[PDB]
Design an enzyme around this catalytic site. Structure first.
Site, mmCIF file in Angstrom:
data_model
loop_
_atom_site.group_PDB
_atom_site.id
_atom_site.type_symbol
_atom_site.label_atom_id
_atom_site.label_comp_id
_atom_site.label_asym_id
_atom_site.label_seq_id
_atom_site.Cartn_x
_atom_site.Cartn_y
_atom_site.Cartn_z
ATOM 1 N N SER A 87 26.347 34.127 -47.592
ATOM 2 C CA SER A 87 25.581 34.999 -46.683
ATOM 3 C C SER A 87 26.368 36.268 -46.315
ATOM 4 O O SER A 87 27.523 36.134 -45.870
ATOM 5 C CB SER A 87 25.171 34.269 -45.475
ATOM 6 O OG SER A 87 24.524 35.155 -44.579
ATOM 7 N N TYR A 100 25.904 30.580 -37.415
ATOM 8 C CA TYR A 100 25.616 30.660 -38.859
ATOM 9 C C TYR A 100 26.617 31.606 -39.541
ATOM 10 O O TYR A 100 27.080 31.295 -40.671
ATOM 11 C CB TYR A 100 24.203 31.172 -39.066
ATOM 12 C CG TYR A 100 23.668 30.935 -40.445
ATOM 13 C CD1 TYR A 100 23.282 29.667 -40.840
ATOM 14 C CD2 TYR A 100 23.516 31.977 -41.333
ATOM 15 C CE1 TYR A 100 22.686 29.446 -42.070
ATOM 16 C CE2 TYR A 100 22.934 31.775 -42.576
ATOM 17 C CZ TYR A 100 22.514 30.506 -42.937
ATOM 18 O OH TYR A 100 21.936 30.332 -44.140
#
Lengths: 230, 240, 228, 224
Positions: B131, B144
């Site tokens: 990510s 996250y």
């Protein structure tokens, strides 16, 4: 006993490659042709401010412009650099870039499509000794690409760069150097990959970035240096 | 009878052969995040795709999945749960544990399970589907982002370490990829979303699932043997 | 042996693991510059302990998240759950517990700083540091996200990412004095010497100062050019 | 205070861009400031300015023209030449002039006041961005090269600093400017001239001897 004896990724793209006889020009022209491109190879050093617009004009329809620009990098100590070295390096590596882009962008803006790939240097990303003039020139290329890529992306135009080092380039890694065990020890210390990136590996990555699959990449710098810079 | 045919009949997908022929590629959580698209694109390029659909919170499970596969040329570490949207001041142990247990902790279990066969033959690839939230700060993504940062830093360290053994460990760091979970039709049909997307994302559109998977397929190919310990942002210029 | 300065004036600064890693030098330098230093010495593997420490300290202007255990150097293919859990439990898991404990008072005031003492191993790959690097990467990505998130509340969250700092744990005097080490150091670290503990702490002190209110969600490599 | 006590600091284009703030703050921090106000397009001028100054402890390379806003496909040779002549070409002229005295005593600092436009792409800034990228890559290479001689060469890469050239009161008062700024700049306000200059002052101090060939983004999180 039987064993003794027993591509179209760039199909229909017209791709102009500058200084096609040096730096990455030979590998790009060879691999792009294998992959179905119509390669327009130009061999001119582009110190002449008028020449880029003439080369672009004369090439007609260009889908992809590969800005392959180089002179041998000066090794001059940073405190000894003179105006002649600075102008020779920037005249060859930097000044031609906008001249090529302003010549080719009108046709790409008209059709809302096209690519420009700069064959740049990881010397602009990671500092090294005795390469100050070349590093500075190469940084002008990468920052031009980051700005132009953001700017032309809304026009359907992808402008990116490779930032390479430790590629199997005979200009910098002649066979007698590669064969030298002191060289091999330095290489293994400095380059995680533990070997030079092949000319083919470099050109295949370039070919990916010139392909429809890479339309999602805009203004991006891709280090290709075997982990020396990532 | 399907409605995509009114306007999308007879169209050849972007990048339409044998780039991954004879490669055994194991894709984790093959049924979620990028799993489906990766499985489809890798098969399209001639891979033999080993698709595992398990969430890998169980510490014993990674070793068992690698063991049962036999030969693995390429391991694609596709790990995901729905990203918490929790305000940074409100994050709790349950959220942190849930995210790290799913996204971070399986990663070294998978790698320690598959690395011995790769070391022995001096070949193999590990690609982490990571990510760009780990590269560039965004709001309400702290847990996250931290979990995704553990992945990218693991990759940079392991890729340097395993390169001399003939093994390539790399990552994609994606954002603004057209995953309908994060970009539902109702969002895409909102003009303010399109206007904000063109502001925040230089590309001016979502990266297609296919574009992302075609890049993963390149990184899984022999041509990409030159890349070790490298993070590749795939976010339409949001992070480069 | 064998047998045996007002830069931070009026700021309350809590330093975690104050006896360990950068703790001692941070405490010394911050005190030199007028800070009221709260030195907490606890390893923070216990989940309940960060809230207790923050509660007991009262008013905190600056939280310095100094978390460390000796870095594992296990080969990547041989790492087990015990190593992973011990490293993340010490270096990663405490970080949000400390931040969620201290942020309410800072949000209430619309002011405050959180500085993570992180590692450049999270920025540049090195051999035999996979677990430790992964943990340190969680710290830096947490800071980047939290810094963007909390900036509008007038709170500055930043990180140092250090390496090649004159930490006797990792660089004993006898090693520093070795000419083969001196050769490798000059090769691998442009500075050609280790960053002094004081240089690191003085930069930490600048980031904890009002002058640094312009820095939000930023990582500052401190590794003598090894990572920039 | 006396963070820069007894240091002779030469600030180029001391009347332009960050010049005035740098001169004020460095003197506030106990420096002896040598302010030079010339545009340095003349190739001969940097060597003369350094020569006339005698001892220089710190050279602050503050080089600027107003940034062209020209569309990338419309840039011509005169804009390219004007920008590189002012912002890039004088840089090594200044460094080659001052470095011999620094190499001889094994000490000194060179700080480039650069631009975060070289780090992160922005529209309608192609020429300026390219020029600013030449500065940052020069610093990274020179900083590695000069570090072993006990010289520190670093850069700031700034954006969204409260510089009236780019953010006059009229722009700052527009609520549509204030909305965009809070969208684009995590800090939620412009970096102050003083904040920028105090960071520069830190980098010119003995405490910052540990920083070599490093670029420091100063843009309120726009580029980090």
């Amino acid at each position: 006993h039987h064993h003794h004896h027993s591509n179209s990724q760039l199909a229909g793209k017209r791709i102009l490659v500058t200084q096609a006889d040096t730096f990455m020009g030979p590998t790009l022209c060879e691999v792009f042709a294998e992959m179905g491109a119509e390669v327009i190879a130009d061999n001119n050093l582009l110190t002449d401010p008028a020449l880029p617009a003439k080369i672009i004009q004369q090439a007609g329809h260009i889908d992809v412009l590969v800005i392959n620009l180089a002179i041998p990098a000066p090794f001059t100590k940073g405190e000894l650099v003179d105006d002649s070295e600075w102008s020779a390096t920037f005249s060859a590596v930097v000044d031609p870039m906008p001249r090529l882009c302003t010549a080719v962008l009108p046709q790409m803006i008209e059709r809302q499509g096209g690519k420009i790939l700069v064959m740049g240097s990881a010397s602009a990303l990671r500092g090294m000794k005795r390469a100050s003039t070349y590093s500075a020139a190469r940084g002008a290329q990468l920052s031009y690409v980051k700005a132009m890529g953001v700017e032309m992306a809304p026009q359907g135009i992808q402008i990116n760069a490779i930032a390479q080092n430790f590629v199997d380039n005979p200009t910098y890694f002649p066979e007698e150097t590669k064969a030298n065990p002191k060289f091999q020890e330095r290489l293994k210390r400095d380059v995680p990959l533990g070997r030079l990136v092949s000319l083919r590996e470099d050109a295949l990555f370039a070919a990916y970035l010139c392909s429809d699959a890479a339309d999602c990449f805009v203004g991006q710098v891709f280090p290709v240096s075997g982990g020396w810079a990532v």
